[PDB]
DNA sequence: CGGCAGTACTG
DNA sequence: CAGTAC
DNA sequence: GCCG
């Protein structure tokens, strides 16, 4: 696996500092570089050998900094606000600009957020389940959640099928997220069961809190009935059968996977989002793009000129 | 240099 | 409009 | 942050 973890560690700390400080691109380059250093077959030996890794000049300059020295000195200049901002980012619905606001307001602890800090409804639901949301769950409990949502959905219409796309479907032992995709094979009967099932599950108590409540997209908190059960974040999306193959890809993950798939689709003049695979829109543009039917996940790998990758092989 | 995904919700 | 989310 |  990671043959250069002594450097990937210190760089993941640097990338975290950038991610916590609004520099999404600095963090994205760092993460793509750690994801490349962790997947490389042999450990690094020189600067030349480091830069040839698809790693730049200043990144391999840090690789060589940790290869010749034992501690990267960039880390010594990291701002002391980085931990506080990261802590505020650990709250749901709270990112770099809200952590920055809380920080300049003199807040330096979660208790300060729960006492004097102004919170939104979502930032409150995140602040109350702070520990649970950071404790990823075993695959078995995610399966319990999946089957529970599927059974309750099938009671409204037995034709409906469900799938727990996400790190679970990728085969990851832990999952601090549960995204259940529900659809109907005909693509027309699905319309109208979202609210009924959502109220059903909240009535029984499967759902504890609600975050983003849209017509087609549900985001909230669930908790399996039983002792010592921690609150897990669940999303329930009811998209038509036509778009199911384009949705199941994105909601399977990872993000970096759908980022490389989106780049590859863009080079071949195609837009690959979580709703449909369309080709290049007319060009300022003088027209939208043309949808390409892709019923199965292989059809999407096909129209993109790529071999089918198993969900297990989607960490990119 | 300049692009790195586009989207819906919430406020 | 922006912020945070997938 | 890297790379076309
Ligand atoms: Ca996830
Ligand atoms: Na966060
Ligand atoms: Na339980």
Residue numbers in the entry: 250 to 303, 305 to 464, 470 to 538, 543 to 575
Please share text taken word for word from the publication where this structure appeared.
Biochemical assays, site-directed mutagenesis, and X-ray structures of mutants of human Polλ incorporating sequence determinants from P. tetraurelia PolX or metazoan Polβ are used to investigate the origin of their fidelity. To further probe this mechanism, we engineered and purified five mutants of human DNA polymerase λ, the closest relative of Ptet-PolX, targeting residues that contribute to the induced-fit mechanism of Polβ or that are suspected to contribute to a similar mechanism of Ptet-PolXs. These constructs also included the following mutations to facilitate crystallization and diffraction: Δ1–241, KGET, and C543A. Because we could not crystallize P. tetraurelia PolX itself with various DNA substrates, we set out to crystallize mutants of human Polλ incorporating sequence determinants from P. tetraurelia PolX or metazoan Polβ: these structures indicate that a Loop3-based fidelity mechanism is incompatible with the fidelity determinants of Polβ, which is based on a large conformational change (open-to-close transition).
The Polλxt-R construct contains the I492R mutation that involves the position equivalent to Polβ’s R258 residue, and the Polλxt-R-SD2β mutant has an additional mutation giving it the SD2 motif of Polβ (NEY). When this mutant was further engineered to include the SD2 motif of Polβ (NEY), enzymatic activity was nearly abolished (10-fold lower kobs), despite an almost normal KM in the millimolar range. Crystallographic data for this mutant produced different results compared to the other mutants. While the other constructs (including Polλxt obtained by Jamsen et al.) crystallized in the P212121 space group with one molecule per asymmetric unit, this specific mutant crystallized in the H32 space group with two molecules in the asymmetric unit, displaying highly anisotropic diffraction data, resulting in two very similar structures that differ only in their respective Loop3. Both molecules exhibit a closed conformation, an absence of incoming nucleotide in the active site, and R492 positioned between catalytic D429 and the NEY SD2 motif (∼3.5–4 Å apart), suggesting stabilization via salt bridges. In these structures, Loop3 fails to engage with the DNA template strand, which is improperly positioned for catalysis, with missing density for four and two residues in the two molecules of the asymmetric unit. In the Polλxt-R-SD2β mutant, where H530 is replaced with tyrosine, this interaction is lost. The tyrosine hydroxyl group pushes the DNA phosphate away, displacing the DNA and disrupting interactions. Only seven residues remain interacting with the DNA, insufficient for stabilization, causing the templating nucleotide to be mispositioned and preventing proper stabilization of the incoming nucleotide.
